[PDB]
Write a protein that holds these residues in place. Structure first.
Motif, PDB file in Angstrom:
ATOM      1  N   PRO A 177      -6.724   5.462  29.928  1.00  0.00           N
ATOM      2  CA  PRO A 177      -6.242   4.592  28.851  1.00  0.00           C
ATOM      3  C   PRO A 177      -6.775   5.016  27.491  1.00  0.00           C
ATOM      4  CG  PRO A 177      -7.900   3.478  30.167  1.00  0.00           C
ATOM      5  CD  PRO A 177      -7.535   4.722  30.909  1.00  0.00           C
ATOM      6  N   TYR A 178      -5.994   4.723  26.461  1.00  0.00           N
ATOM      7  CA  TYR A 178      -6.195   5.346  25.169  1.00  0.00           C
ATOM      8  C   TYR A 178      -5.822   4.389  24.045  1.00  0.00           C
ATOM      9  CZ  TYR A 178      -1.319   5.979  26.410  1.00  0.00           C
ATOM     10  OH  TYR A 178      -0.010   5.771  26.802  1.00  0.00           O
ATOM     11  N   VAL A 179      -6.400   4.621  22.864  1.00  0.00           N
ATOM     12  CA  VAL A 179      -6.033   3.870  21.670  1.00  0.00           C
ATOM     13  C   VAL A 179      -5.792   4.855  20.538  1.00  0.00           C
ATOM     14  CG1 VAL A 179      -6.737   2.124  19.990  1.00  0.00           C
ATOM     15  CG2 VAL A 179      -7.270   1.820  22.412  1.00  0.00           C
ATOM     16  N   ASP A 180      -4.521   5.181  20.305  1.00  0.00           N
ATOM     17  CA  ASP A 180      -4.195   6.226  19.345  1.00  0.00           C
ATOM     18  C   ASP A 180      -4.010   5.666  17.940  1.00  0.00           C
ATOM     19  OD1 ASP A 180      -3.688   7.473  22.009  1.00  0.00           O
ATOM     20  OD2 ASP A 180      -1.736   6.505  21.795  1.00  0.00           O
ATOM     21  N   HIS A 181      -3.349   4.516  17.818  1.00  0.00           N
ATOM     22  CA  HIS A 181      -3.058   3.914  16.522  1.00  0.00           C
ATOM     23  C   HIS A 181      -4.163   2.921  16.165  1.00  0.00           C
ATOM     24  CE1 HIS A 181       1.039   5.222  17.968  1.00  0.00           C
ATOM     25  NE2 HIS A 181       0.947   5.838  16.803  1.00  0.00           N
ATOM     26  N   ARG A 182      -3.909   2.065  15.173  1.00  0.00           N
ATOM     27  CA  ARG A 182      -4.952   1.214  14.618  1.00  0.00           C
ATOM     28  C   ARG A 182      -5.599   0.370  15.707  1.00  0.00           C
ATOM     29  NH1 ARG A 182      -4.894  -4.155  11.227  1.00  0.00           N
ATOM     30  NH2 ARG A 182      -4.018  -4.542  13.307  1.00  0.00           N
ATOM     31  N   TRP A 183      -6.899   0.136  15.560  1.00  0.00           N
ATOM     32  CA  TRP A 183      -7.656  -0.616  16.557  1.00  0.00           C
ATOM     33  C   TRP A 183      -7.475  -2.094  16.242  1.00  0.00           C
ATOM     34  CZ3 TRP A 183     -10.799  -0.166  20.861  1.00  0.00           C
ATOM     35  CH2 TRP A 183     -11.662  -1.234  21.125  1.00  0.00           C
ATOM     36  N   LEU A 184      -6.752  -2.797  17.110  1.00  0.00           N
ATOM     37  CA  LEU A 184      -6.548  -4.226  16.929  1.00  0.00           C
ATOM     38  C   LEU A 184      -7.821  -4.970  17.293  1.00  0.00           C
ATOM     39  CD1 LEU A 184      -3.190  -4.210  18.911  1.00  0.00           C
ATOM     40  CD2 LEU A 184      -3.539  -3.591  16.514  1.00  0.00           C
ATOM     41  N   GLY A 185      -8.215  -5.917  16.450  1.00  0.00           N
ATOM     42  CA  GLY A 185      -9.488  -6.579  16.632  1.00  0.00           C
ATOM     43  C   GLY A 185      -9.604  -7.338  17.941  1.00  0.00           C
ATOM     44  N   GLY A 186     -10.753  -7.160  18.588  1.00  0.00           N
ATOM     45  CA  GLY A 186     -11.153  -8.014  19.687  1.00  0.00           C
ATOM     46  C   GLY A 186     -10.385  -7.885  20.981  1.00  0.00           C
ATOM     47  N   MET A 187      -9.780  -6.731  21.275  1.00  0.00           N
ATOM     48  CA  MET A 187      -9.118  -6.575  22.568  1.00  0.00           C
ATOM     49  C   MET A 187     -10.127  -6.696  23.704  1.00  0.00           C
ATOM     50  SD  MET A 187      -6.846  -3.461  21.079  1.00  0.00           S
ATOM     51  CE  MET A 187      -8.499  -2.837  20.812  1.00  0.00           C
ATOM     52  N   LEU A 188     -11.364  -6.254  23.467  1.00  0.00           N
ATOM     53  CA  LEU A 188     -12.405  -6.300  24.486  1.00  0.00           C
ATOM     54  C   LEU A 188     -13.136  -7.639  24.513  1.00  0.00           C
ATOM     55  CD1 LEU A 188     -11.813  -3.481  25.180  1.00  0.00           C
ATOM     56  CD2 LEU A 188     -14.109  -2.749  24.530  1.00  0.00           C
ATOM     57  N   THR A 189     -13.561  -8.150  23.361  1.00  0.00           N
ATOM     58  CA  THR A 189     -14.271  -9.423  23.334  1.00  0.00           C
ATOM     59  C   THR A 189     -13.346 -10.620  23.529  1.00  0.00           C
ATOM     60  OG1 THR A 189     -14.106  -9.748  20.941  1.00  0.00           O
ATOM     61  CG2 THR A 189     -15.873  -8.338  21.737  1.00  0.00           C
TER      62      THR A 189
ATOM     63  N   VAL B 247     -12.428   5.378  31.961  1.00  0.00           N
ATOM     64  CA  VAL B 247     -13.022   5.705  30.669  1.00  0.00           C
ATOM     65  C   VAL B 247     -11.950   5.582  29.596  1.00  0.00           C
ATOM     66  CG1 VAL B 247     -14.657   7.245  29.555  1.00  0.00           C
ATOM     67  CG2 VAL B 247     -14.273   7.412  32.019  1.00  0.00           C
ATOM     68  N   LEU B 248     -12.170   4.683  28.642  1.00  0.00           N
ATOM     69  CA  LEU B 248     -11.218   4.494  27.558  1.00  0.00           C
ATOM     70  C   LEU B 248     -11.415   5.582  26.509  1.00  0.00           C
ATOM     71  CD1 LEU B 248     -10.173   3.024  24.712  1.00  0.00           C
ATOM     72  CD2 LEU B 248      -9.019   2.264  26.778  1.00  0.00           C
ATOM     73  N   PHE B 249     -10.315   6.022  25.905  1.00  0.00           N
ATOM     74  CA  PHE B 249     -10.325   7.069  24.890  1.00  0.00           C
ATOM     75  C   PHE B 249     -10.012   6.436  23.543  1.00  0.00           C
ATOM     76  CE2 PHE B 249     -10.066  11.397  27.004  1.00  0.00           C
ATOM     77  CZ  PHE B 249     -10.596  10.943  28.193  1.00  0.00           C
ATOM     78  N   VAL B 250     -10.847   6.706  22.544  1.00  0.00           N
ATOM     79  CA  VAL B 250     -10.730   6.081  21.234  1.00  0.00           C
ATOM     80  C   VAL B 250     -10.638   7.176  20.183  1.00  0.00           C
ATOM     81  CG1 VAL B 250     -11.669   4.408  19.628  1.00  0.00           C
ATOM     82  CG2 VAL B 250     -12.137   4.174  22.072  1.00  0.00           C
ATOM     83  N   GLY B 251      -9.456   7.314  19.591  1.00  0.00           N
ATOM     84  CA  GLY B 251      -9.293   8.060  18.362  1.00  0.00           C
ATOM     85  C   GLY B 251      -8.109   7.543  17.572  1.00  0.00           C
ATOM     86  N   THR B 252      -8.345   7.143  16.326  1.00  0.00           N
ATOM     87  CA  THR B 252      -7.293   6.630  15.461  1.00  0.00           C
ATOM     88  C   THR B 252      -7.126   7.454  14.195  1.00  0.00           C
ATOM     89  OG1 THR B 252      -6.730   4.786  13.991  1.00  0.00           O
ATOM     90  CG2 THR B 252      -9.016   4.986  14.690  1.00  0.00           C
ATOM     91  N   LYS B 253      -7.923   8.505  14.027  1.00  0.00           N
ATOM     92  CA  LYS B 253      -7.777   9.376  12.872  1.00  0.00           C
ATOM     93  C   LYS B 253      -6.436  10.095  12.929  1.00  0.00           C
ATOM     94  CE  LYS B 253     -11.903  10.985  10.587  1.00  0.00           C
ATOM     95  NZ  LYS B 253     -12.902  12.083  10.479  1.00  0.00           N
ATOM     96  N   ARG B 254      -5.945  10.506  11.759  1.00  0.00           N
ATOM     97  CA  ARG B 254      -4.663  11.200  11.697  1.00  0.00           C
ATOM     98  C   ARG B 254      -4.696  12.502  12.487  1.00  0.00           C
ATOM     99  NH1 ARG B 254      -3.637  14.576   8.454  1.00  0.00           N
ATOM    100  NH2 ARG B 254      -5.123  13.878   6.860  1.00  0.00           N
ATOM    101  N   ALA B 255      -5.754  13.295  12.313  1.00  0.00           N
ATOM    102  CA  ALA B 255      -5.787  14.623  12.918  1.00  0.00           C
ATOM    103  C   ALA B 255      -6.045  14.556  14.418  1.00  0.00           C
ATOM    104  CB  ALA B 255      -6.844  15.487  12.230  1.00  0.00           C
ATOM    105  N   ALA B 256      -6.955  13.683  14.848  1.00  0.00           N
ATOM    106  CA  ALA B 256      -7.414  13.662  16.231  1.00  0.00           C
ATOM    107  C   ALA B 256      -6.506  12.867  17.159  1.00  0.00           C
ATOM    108  CB  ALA B 256      -8.839  13.103  16.304  1.00  0.00           C
ATOM    109  N   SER B 257      -5.542  12.120  16.615  1.00  0.00           N
ATOM    110  CA  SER B 257      -4.705  11.259  17.443  1.00  0.00           C
ATOM    111  C   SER B 257      -3.841  12.071  18.405  1.00  0.00           C
ATOM    112  CB  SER B 257      -3.837  10.367  16.554  1.00  0.00           C
ATOM    113  OG  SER B 257      -3.205   9.346  17.305  1.00  0.00           O
ATOM    114  N   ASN B 258      -3.157  13.103  17.904  1.00  0.00           N
ATOM    115  CA  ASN B 258      -2.279  13.891  18.768  1.00  0.00           C
ATOM    116  C   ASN B 258      -3.067  14.605  19.859  1.00  0.00           C
ATOM    117  OD1 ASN B 258       0.575  15.490  19.041  1.00  0.00           O
ATOM    118  ND2 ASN B 258      -1.150  16.913  19.254  1.00  0.00           N
TER     119      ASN B 258
END
Length: 225
Positions: free
Chosen positions: A89-101, A66-77
């Motif tokens: 696996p996680y995405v804390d910083h900016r979401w780079l386009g198209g990693m999945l597609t 299960v991938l975890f997605v949060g890039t907001k300032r408050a919710a990242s930590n």
RNA sequence: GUCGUCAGCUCGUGUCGUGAGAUGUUGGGUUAAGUCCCGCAACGAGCGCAACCCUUUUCCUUACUUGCCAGCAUUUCGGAU
């Protein structure tokens, strides 16, 4: 591992955004507004959260990731602490386009990030002098910040878990394109159109974010099969 | 020859568009420079820019003639010997 409800009220999940910024599709969950801020019931929240935890437990039992997605300032930590705790696996910083597609491209980056980390662990960097050593120490730090989560992943995640659907709209679009289910937190100003399991809750409150992330992490850890 | 040593010209895979096409190359700083750093459905490449080539400035090794003369000696006082 159920949350009951009292945790949600004490954290503050009932508060939402201002009325003028509401999305009319939330009319079912809003249930009223004490003041210029919408207040959402937790009665509808609780079964949806429990079912989300149940599906997460099923995924952990089947060993799906299960991938975890949060890039907001408050919710990242918070999503960081809970994602390390759950080993996901996680995405804390900016979401780079198209990693999945565009799965093919980014593992070029992943393999030379792993190679840079292994070279740093080895004595290769020690031979090389300070200037350009500092150069790809910076450079590897830049790859690490963007790809801190997905070196360990070898394939598409089976499910997503997103904090802010409106903020991470692109991630939901990619997940919808690929057919992989998404559990996401939807707020007052959010769009639930493509969320498979819709559970409504606050996004501003760090307490609410911590409770949600800890609940999912506990679900994965309690899979244990 | 000239614009002009002006700094741009492109491709792969993804997304948007019925379509020709678009995005990357955009915004904020900085630089000789699309030079670099942040921001950013874009992520990475190639040719251009820079470097590799020649010359000048400091030092070291090898080489001691047709070039050199610090120390010694002879001087017709000219490294002349």
């Amino acid at each position: 591992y159920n949350v009951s409800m009292r945790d949600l009220l004490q954290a503050g999940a009932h508060f939402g955004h201002q009325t003028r910024f509401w999305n009319p599709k939330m009319r079912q969950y809003i249930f009223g507004a004490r003041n210029k801020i919408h207040i959402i019931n937790l009665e509808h929240t609780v079964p949806a959260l429990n079912d989300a935890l149940n599906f997460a437990n099923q995924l952990a039992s089947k060993k799906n990731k299960v991938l975890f997605v949060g890039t907001k300032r408050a919710a990242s930590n918070i999503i960081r602490e809970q994602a390390q705790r759950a080993g996901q696996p996680y995405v804390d910083h900016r979401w780079l386009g198209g990693m999945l597609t565009n799965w093919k491209t980014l593992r070029q980056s992943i393999n030379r990030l792993k190679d840079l980390q292994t070279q740093s662990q080895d004595g290769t960097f020690a031979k090389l002098t300070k200037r350009e050593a500092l150069e790809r120490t910076r450079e590897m730090e830049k790859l690490e910040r963007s790809l801190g989560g997905v070196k360990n992943m070898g394939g598409l995640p089976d499910a997503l878990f997103v904090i802010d659907v409106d903020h991470e709209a692109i991630a939901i679009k990619e997940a919808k394109n690929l057919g992989i289910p998404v559990i996401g937190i939807v707020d007052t100003n959010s769009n639930p159109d493509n969320v498979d399991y819709v559970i409504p809750g606050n996004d501003d409150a760090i307490r609410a974010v911590t409770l949600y992330a800890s609940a999912m992490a506990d679900a994965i850890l309690a899979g244990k099969e």
